[PDB]
C-alpha cells in the first residue's frame, strides 16, 4: 500500500488494459494523449516536438486507432495531423483510460482495426451533500510546470464538477547538449452538471474548452493555436425491466480550431520554400451520438445499439504582399469548407457464459459511411478540383468472435479471437495526398476502404507472486492505405492501396520477490509486409523491452527502469503515412531511469524521477525528420530528451 510510479501498465483482462491516468508515470508524460500510451506495451509515438506525438499501435497509425473521450470523437484539422486527436486530450483530467487491442469490439464505432482507446470520466456518486477535490502540481527541467484541479460538489439529487489544467515546458535538450525546438503550452477547463433523480437515472451536461501551442522541430511550421470547444449530453437509465439492464444515450459536439504558422514560434527560414511570413487556419466540427441497450438474462448478455457521426473541415490562409512587406492574416478571409463526412451504424455484441470457466463473445456492426469533397479549387497558384462537390459512400460490415477459457488447476485464462474490420478512408487519406492511385483524378476519387482480418490470441495468469500476460496477433490487410513520398521540388505524396500481412505481440510479467521487492518486464513486437510490392511496411516500431525493479517499504517506494530498443532494419524508404516516411534503418539504444514516491498523509503524496539518467543521445525510428531551418540535415530525425528531472505532488481531499 506504499505509492509508486507507473512505468508500465499490464494487460488486465483479455486484449484489455485499464489504468488510472492520474498516477505518476516514469518517463514523464507531456500532458497529451500519446504520452500516456507509451506506458502500455504495443504503443509507440511519432515525435513532432516536445508534445503532441502521433500514437502508433502495433505499428498501426492514424484512424486505425479509435480514440474516444467520454464516448465522443475529437478530430483535429491540420492537413498533416500537426494536431492529432491526442493533442487535444489531457489524460490527467480523466479518471480511466481503457485500451482494447484488435478489432474485437463493435460498441464504440467504425473502423477500429488496430484498437480502440477510451478516456472516461465517471459520474460523481454523492450520498450526503458534500464535496471532493483532488489536484496535483508538477515541476521539472526546462521550465516544466503543470497544475491540475478536479473538484466536485453535490448530493443524492445532483452534482456540479470542474476539472482543469495548465501545463507548459520550454525547449528541452537532447543528450548531445543541443536545444531542441520543442516548447509547448496547454490549458483545459471543463464543467459537468449531473442530475440523478433516482439511482436508476443519471443525466449529465458537459462543456469545456482548451487551448495550447507547440513548437515542432519536426515540421516547417508550428502550432500557435489548438482551440477546442466541447458540448456533451449523456443519459443512463438502469433496471428498466427484468431483462433490460441499462439504456444509455449520448450526444457530443467537438470543435477544433488550429493555427499553423512560421513566424509566431520561429523565424521564417529564408533558405526554404517559405521565406515570407505565412499562417494557415483550419477547423474541424464533429457532431455525433450513441444509443445502446444492454440486455441480461440466463447465461447471456446482449448489447444492441446504433450510432451516428458527422464532421466538417474548413481552412483559410494568409497572404503576403511580396512587392511590399504587407501581411494579411488568415482571419481576414472567409473559411473554405473542403470536406464533410457522415457515418451511421448499427451494432450488437452477444456474450454466452457457458458453464463458469467458459465465455464466448460475438459482435457485429454495419456502417454506412459517406464523404463529400467541397473543395472548389486546389493548391502552385490555384487550379481546378476535378471532384468538386462529388459524393461517395459505402456500406461496411465488421465483426468478431472470441472464445475465453479458464483453466481449473491454476488461475489461467486462454483466449483466441477472429475479427474483421472495414474502415472508410479518413480526412487525411482522401484530401491530404497530392496524388491518388495511378490513373486516378485524385485520391478522393479512388482510395478504397481498408479491410483487416486478424487472429488475436493470448493468456492471463493471476497468481499471488507472479502475474503474467501475453497477446499475439496475425492478420491480413486488404487495400492498406499507403503513402509514398516522391520528393523531386518539395515533397509530393501519393496515396495507394496495397495488400499487407501483419503479425506481432506483446507480453509482460510482474513478480513479487518479497514483501518489499517487486520486479516486472514487458516486450512489444510488431511486424509488417507490403504484399503488393514485396517489401516491408514503413513506419514500424522496432522490438522493445522494459525492465522495472521496485522496492516498497511502509510509506515510500524507489524504483529503477531500463528501456531497451532493438534497431529497425525492416524499412520502406520514402513510404509511410500522412505524417512521416521511412528513410534510414534506426539504431538500437538503451535508456535508464530512477523514481521514488512517498505518502506524507492520506491526502498528500510526493513523486520524483530522473528520466534518461545517463543523458543518452538517441532518437526513435518513428520520429519525424528535423527541419532544415533548424539545425537538422537530411532525414536526421528529432532526438528524444536528454536527462530530465521531475517532481510532483498529489492532493486528494
Ligand atoms: Ag501544419
Ligand atoms: Ag508554411
Ligand atoms: Ag508562402
Numbering used by the authors: 66 to 444, 449 to 557, 559 to 723
What does the paper say about this structure?
Here, we show that Pseudomonas aeruginosa OprC is an outer membrane, TonB-dependent transporter that is conserved in many Proteobacteria and which mediates acquisition of both reduced and oxidised ionic copper via an unprecedented CxxxM-HxM metal binding site. As indicated by the successful structure solution, OprC contains a single bound copper and shows the typical fold of a TBDT, with a large 22-stranded β-barrel occluded by an N-terminal approximately 15 kDa plug domain that, like in other TBDTs, completely occludes the lumen of the barrel. The copper binding site comprises residues Cys143 and Met147 in the plug domain and His323 and Met325 in the barrel wall. The CxxxM-HxM configuration, which coordinates the copper in a tetrahedral manner, is highly unusual and has, to our knowledge, not been observed before in copper homeostasis proteins.
Since Cu(II) prefers histidine nitrogen as ligands and Cu(II) binding sites often contain one or more His residues, we also cocrystallised the H323A mutant with Cu(II) and Ag(I). With Ag(I), 2 clear anomalous peaks are observed, suggesting that the H323A mutant can still bind Cu(I) at the principal site and at the methionine track. All 4 residues in the OprC binding site contribute to copper binding, but not to the same extent and, in some cases, not equally for both copper redox states. By contrast, removal of His323 still allows Cu(II) and Cu(I) binding.
